[PDB]
Design a protein around this ligand. Sequence first.
Ligand SMILES: *C[C@H](N)C(=O)/C=C/OP(=O)(O)O
Ligand SMILES: *C[C@H](N)C(=O)/C=C/OP(=O)(O)O
Ligand SMILES: *C[C@H](N)C(=O)/C=C/OP(=O)(O)O
Ligand SMILES: *C[C@H](N)C(=O)/C=C/OP(=O)(O)O
Ligand SMILES: *C[C@H](N)C(=O)/C=C/OP(=O)(O)O
Lengths: 271, 270, 272, 271, 270
Amino acid sequence: KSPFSVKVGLAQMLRGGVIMDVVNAEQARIAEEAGACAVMALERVPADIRAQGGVARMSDPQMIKEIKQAVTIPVMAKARIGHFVEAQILEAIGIDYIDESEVLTLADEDHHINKHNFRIPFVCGCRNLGEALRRIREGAAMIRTRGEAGTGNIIEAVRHVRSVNGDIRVLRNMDDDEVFTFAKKLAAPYDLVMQTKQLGRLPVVQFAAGGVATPADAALMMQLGCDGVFVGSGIFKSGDPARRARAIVQAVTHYSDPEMLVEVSCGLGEA
Amino acid sequence: PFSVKVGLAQMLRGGVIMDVVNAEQARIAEEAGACAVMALERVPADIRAQGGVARMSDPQMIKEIKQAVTIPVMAKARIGHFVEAQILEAIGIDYIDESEVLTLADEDHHINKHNFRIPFVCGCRNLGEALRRIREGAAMIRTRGEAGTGNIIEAVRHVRSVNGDIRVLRNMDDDEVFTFAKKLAAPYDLVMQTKQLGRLPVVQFAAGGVATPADAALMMQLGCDGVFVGSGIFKSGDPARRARAIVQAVTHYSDPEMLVEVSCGLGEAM
Amino acid sequence: KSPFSVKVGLAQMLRGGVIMDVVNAEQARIAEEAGACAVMALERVPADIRAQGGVARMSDPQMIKEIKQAVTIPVMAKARIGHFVEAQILEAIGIDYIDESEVLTLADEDHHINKHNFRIPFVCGCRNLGEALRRIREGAAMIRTRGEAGTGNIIEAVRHVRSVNGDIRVLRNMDDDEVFTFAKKLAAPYDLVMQTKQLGRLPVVQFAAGGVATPADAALMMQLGCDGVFVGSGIFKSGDPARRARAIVQAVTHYSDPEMLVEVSCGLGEAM
Amino acid sequence: SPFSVKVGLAQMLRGGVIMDVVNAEQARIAEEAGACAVMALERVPADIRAQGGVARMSDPQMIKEIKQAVTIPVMAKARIGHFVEAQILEAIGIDYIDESEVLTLADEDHHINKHNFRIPFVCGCRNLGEALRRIREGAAMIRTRGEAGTGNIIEAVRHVRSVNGDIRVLRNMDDDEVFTFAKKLAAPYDLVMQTKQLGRLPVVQFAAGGVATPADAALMMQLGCDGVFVGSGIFKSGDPARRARAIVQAVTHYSDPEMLVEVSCGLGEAM
Amino acid sequence: PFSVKVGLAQMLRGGVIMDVVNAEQARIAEEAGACAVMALERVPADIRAQGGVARMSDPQMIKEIKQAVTIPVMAKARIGHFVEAQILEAIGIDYIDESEVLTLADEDHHINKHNFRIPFVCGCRNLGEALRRIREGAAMIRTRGEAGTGNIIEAVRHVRSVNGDIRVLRNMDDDEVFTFAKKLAAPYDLVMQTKQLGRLPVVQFAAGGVATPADAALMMQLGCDGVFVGSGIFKSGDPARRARAIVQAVTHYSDPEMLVEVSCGLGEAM
Ligand SMILES: *C[C@H](N)C(=O)/C=C/OP(=O)(O)O
Ligand SMILES: *C[C@H](N)C(=O)/C=C/OP(=O)(O)O
Ligand SMILES: *C[C@H](N)C(=O)/C=C/OP(=O)(O)O
Ligand SMILES: *C[C@H](N)C(=O)/C=C/OP(=O)(O)O
Ligand SMILES: *C[C@H](N)C(=O)/C=C/OP(=O)(O)O
């Protein structure tokens, strides 16, 4: 079994879960108590990063350690795209996942982190199938839609989810002789394209992220065929986080049960 | 059956649907003689004024409005957000408006409304839009107009566009209908059904900017089956009497004497 | 049960066949003896139309009757696009199929013939799935690629075959909720799009046409998923049409047998 | 055959000249002058350019006559994308198929799926990305497209230099930057890495297009090609029998200017 | 001799150069282990924030900083302002940075640095720029980056551009180097010297936006000989410990465990 396939298997254990952005140990315990499958440690949530500006970097290791010691579920953390030394530091803290994240300030305009040089799994974002496969070829063990972080607006995540899944479906019936050109037009490595055609799905876990604000948003992503969701700003920037976090966890667990979605949405407060 | 939902929506023909935000408003609308109410948390004029993401309303406040009236209760879902619509159906309301006044959720696809048991309303700007919404499962169509402005001009453009093309279609050479359907980017079979009926195959309401009884009666005389009014009532001085005035204007849209009576001293519009 | 279903069913008999353009009863006899499934009677073959210019119309009923009397296989004839009276005339002659053909001079730039008003089946051309479905809804019982007629160059027919079958394969697997927008973007009738999605193929017989010059060209169209091929100029604008006609019939029959394809290509004389 | 077995067959053409021929008479001259293979076609590229018309696979009959006339390997052209023309050629029993841009393009968007065949293919290219895409489709040998039928080596020199230049760029490139380089070449990443590891093209690489003189042929070899194609330059000149030997000797002794002089002296009218 | 100045600058390989504004800061920088200090009156982030014309610093304040430390002292002169550089040399400092962070003084020409006894630093964005600066007499090169922002992205682009072209040059066919020098608009002889050495013929530091120890170590792993830090230290909470942290990160740029230690609880960056 390859070290990459082992990393792919680790991320498969989050299948069906919700990953919540947290900024302190208290928020972390709330997220775990509600049933988050993992927490994303950061010092400014995406809606704050947008509203404030300035350079957004890797979080201080000290605060990430506090979150790591406050929960038993997996802890992720963001590194800037291309900042392989920030990833080296996060890996040395002993967290479980690195998100090479477009919500932080781009560090390398032309290249991402070479993720195969690391032991621990990476998440990367994408807007289309070609981007996803390029990130995977670089070593991402898990893929999320980029969406539009910090807006509470689901429209871009829906577009990205549909783009990726729609091109996957196209790929399944496609004449094999046409797959070479299709790989060229996606600027994607052909072997990952054929692997995707063999599986009928993305070769790694695919979560939705960016703008998921409500239980209905979360279940919509799942019915569009994601394996889980990230929620960052939509929980703690609301008036009632500890109850809304549970509602979104419930909505991902029972995403095809409208009676359940009604119950968890009722009197949930201002989003 | 789609034809059952289409027939259900015919009960609204001749009525006014009013946007409401609480049980107090919902009763006023029912008292004035509204044929249905549209539950939401933010009226369209406040959505345009404040901005932000506008979504489906809290199930709780919709339940309150539902328990407070006997007339049918509608609610809005974002375009393409079929799970918001699943929740609305599970609340037990009567109609879902897949609404352009809320923030778009899917830029490329609307809800597959045939997957639902309860009827949908959709907006349109022209006959091709209306027909595509209907083929998707809309049981009722409203003009898009320009919600929140109190300005009737876009609703007039959309009404005239839909009815004008239906009137053109009615007399068109049969052989030319294939090309007409292509140019409308509308399904040919619904186009011929429209040609044979000589009107839209579902109930067609006016919406967007209806501010006065005269606006409401104008939409009726242009050939609509009814009108929506959201901001025009509850963004004005006296909504309780302005609501009844619009109901009267729709019921008596060809009686100028009646329109004068309900317009006189009506106060101040939005 | 429906009369359109009957016409669609009738054209099933051409599956696996070659349809040859002919300009006289002698060419028709050669086409039938070589194994054509049908002949297409016209006064000028597409390569001559292309080279000479002038207005190209329906052929004289007299020469169409002569071809109809010379063979027992079905006889087709071309009408100009939109010329429903040329089609009335051809139907009244008693031929078996009308091809509303882009190879003749366009008669109506905005409308095709309303083919459901007719008793006999029509063939129409297309370049993509939207065109195909629009022709079908107008009443075409059978579809062919447009290709590029009269050139002996298959590049456009390959593009059209791959475009139609490629979109059909995309449609087959598509999320149902997305098919409405797909139909909008094809400018195609939604119900025919959904029918195409359920079958996994075009609801009617689908032939390749335009530029098929060699046995290898014809077998290539069959391997790309066509039901048969039209050949006009490739056969009679060449050195030995009687032998080349045989070879293209055999190539379509044996399209997946390279040893056979070698046999019928070998020493076949100059192509167009 | 396995891909490596096909790559091995083309390797034994190293250091040779492949000559276009139109009859058994031209075929024997080519073999007797020391050609390493002959390319069977019914019109040389200089005549296809001049006369126009659709250019297709040659008649199996004439290909067979050439195949019997010589003992060296026999190649033939198929139009790009015309996989049935390639099925016929393979069934005739020749040794290589050239999926050739000098014939009329049959499929504008896709090349033949060359892995579906037993016998090796040659494909043309103008740059490294093109070469690697053809290889991934199954070509076992690459030639520069050059500019066929003009007797002008300028395009062939550009293509040789572009391919070899980008190969040289690969050798010292940072490993992390190779993913973006593969994207920019629109080429599959693993063949880019293979090219990086070999320091050369993963298949035999010949020059073709406008080779008219011994000096042109030795020039292509000195720029680092494994061999050359010559079509028009030989049998569209004054003495082809002697010019053919002179070009064979120039490729065998491409670094001996004294020999290059001897075979150029009094060689007659080039095309 | 140019080669004497080039050799002098090699003593800085492996170090951090810190911008300072007084003797207090200068000592802190020396205490933390800086290899040199860059005296100026306004740090780059304040130049971008306040505007105005930015010139050579007062000789007096440079003298104070010079008398306060033993490590080499650099100072900035405006690009093309060879008389500002004459004054800096006459003060007796160790290095002049012909600096793009100060207001340009000559749009078309840099200083003829070979006319000077003491070594110069110049910025660059690509290999052609570096080589032209070196031919003019620069004994040391830094990336231009984007000074004052705390953002590493332009420095990464410039480092990768310089090193990537050097790596391309190393393996290039000799015959193609003439055209390569033309396209770089760089002197051919320095290009071949670079090709033969396989690296820049002078010390190459990173500068512009280095805010954290991780940024500093990233520049080193990309192949720089050292780093400049101006605003990143003395526009933050605790500069005395952040300064030592960056020194440690440069000295131990391949030890992730060390980078964690010096980054932990480091406070708040600019
Ligand atoms: C990377 C970060 N955890 C993320 O994915 C943010 C999501 O968008 P948001 O709108 O903040 O939930
Ligand atoms: C969807 C909503 N019920 C509606 O129709 C909006 C009407 O526009 P307004 O200007 O608020 O009357
Ligand atoms: C309508 C005509 N018989 C046809 O189908 C086209 C023939 O084109 P060609 O390229 O001559 O085979
Ligand atoms: C495919 C053909 N034999 C070839 O490789 C190119 C020959 O071109 P020319 O310019 O005639 O030597
Ligand atoms: C010329 C000055 N010493 C310098 O290199 C500026 C660096 O940029 P900063 O963002 O202030 O570290």
